[PDB]
């Protein structure tokens, strides 16, 4: 009484509503530190003038 386990399972069946269907989630956070920027885009570099 008033003492419950904090976690609970998901019910994932093939027949479940799209709202209840499983979704895989990736969250990308972008960070500028006290450090060189080391993750860059594929944009090609050029000569310096």
């Amino acid at each position, epitope marked *: 009484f008033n003492c419950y*386990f904090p976690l609970q*399972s998901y019910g994932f069946q093939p027949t479940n509503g799209v709202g209840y269907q499983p979704y895989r989630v990736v969250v990308l956070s972008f960070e500028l530190l006290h450090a060189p920027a080391t993750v860059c885009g594929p944009k090609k570099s050029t000569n310096l003038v």
Partner: nanobody
Amino acid sequence: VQLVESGGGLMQAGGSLRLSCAVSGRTFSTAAMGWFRQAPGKEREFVAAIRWSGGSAYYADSVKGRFTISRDKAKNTVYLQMNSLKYEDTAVYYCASYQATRSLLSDYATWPYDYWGQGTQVTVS
């Protein structure tokens, strides 16, 4: 998983008995085990459940205060202590495994479980 029960047999009313059921394979750390029983000609009935993590126990009313369920995590074994045996307690008892985790323990009384042991007969004279 495979569930194997032991400890059934003939006992006189008023005695006490400890059941054993070893759980093996992919034993989830945040699951629970329950014991249920089916008497000849009756529906399967929940007896007691224990959560593997933390060891909190939930009992059916017919046995609460008389029976104790326990588990030894290191040994992966759950026990049903059947004290004050009565005639009506005569039945086949099955050890049952839950994979799904519930926030409300009482839900394990009604949840349909995944795997069942073979059962061991206890008969109370």
